[PDB]
Design a protein around this ligand. Structure first.
Ligand SMILES: Cc1cc(C)c2cc1C(=O)NCCCNC(=O)CCSc1cc-2nc(N)n1
Length: 213
């Protein structure tokens, strides 16, 4: 019998409250979740690109800088993969739930005052827009300085971190969105193309879309 170690964490209370606002409030422009995730991937790709200017050995783990979009109707998942800088275990725990960075409180309060969801990325909490369309999010990441980890949350105030048992990545991050039953439009080629063309036209890395037969 295989034994796997899991670490469970509570979201920092303001992040939990922001997540509750995103999950329990209707917002009309939900499609921006994809812009936010592609933006995070592009930022991660910039970090490894700029670091590689003085240290080419940082690309030993992979020299291609790109993004893949993978919908899967059977699993009801939309996956965004990049070959960006990735996150170490510390980065993952620090940035994906235990610390409310400046932006979290300001945006949470802006949403409580009736603001739209559109500017979420400006407040540095764009990742959490995944919860407009997903009931569960899994983040797989690999940084040069560490092992491959899997973060996962179905909201409800908690998340888990474990060393990943899935397919290997040389370096980068994979965000797997387990879509809500009424948000399956985001598995459609036409809808994904619409959103990429509307919101991510100027992304400086190539995006490959895998279209299901
Ligand atoms: C909340 C959050 C969630 C994810 C999944 C990423 C970044 C952040 C974030 O706001 N980090 C704030 C810190 C700045 N971002 C980084 O340093 C990138 C680490 S790699 C990376 C990180 C993320 N997503 C991808 N695709 N690659």
């Amino acid at each position: 019998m295989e034994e796997e170690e899991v670490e469970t964490f509570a979201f920092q209370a303001e992040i939990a409250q922001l997540m509750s606002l995103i999950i329990n409030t209707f917002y009309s422009n939900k499609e921006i979740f994809l812009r936010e995730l592609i933006s995070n991937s592009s930022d991660a790709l910039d970090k490894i690109r700029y670091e590689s200017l003085t240290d080419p050995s940082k690309l030993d783990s992979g020299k291609e800088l790109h993004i893949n979009l993978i919908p899967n109707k059977q699993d009801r998942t939309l996956t965004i993969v990049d070959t960006g800088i990735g996150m170490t275990k510390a980065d993952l725990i620090n940035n994906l739930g235990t610390i409310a960075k400046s932006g979290t409180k300001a945006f949470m309060e802006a949403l409580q005052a009736g603001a739209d969801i559109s500017m979420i990325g400006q407040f540095g909490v764009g990742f959490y827009s995944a919860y407009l369309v997903a009931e569960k999010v899994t983040v797989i990441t690999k940084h040069n300085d560490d092992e491959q980890y899997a973060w996962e949350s179905s909201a409800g105030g908690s998340f888990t971190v474990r060393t990943d048992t899935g397919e290997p990545m040389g370096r980068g991050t994979k965000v797997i969105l387990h879509l809500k039953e009424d948000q399956t439009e985001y598995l459609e080629e036409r809808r994904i193309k619409e959103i990429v063309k509307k919101h991510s036209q100027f992304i400086g890395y190539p995006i490959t879309l895998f279209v299901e037969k």
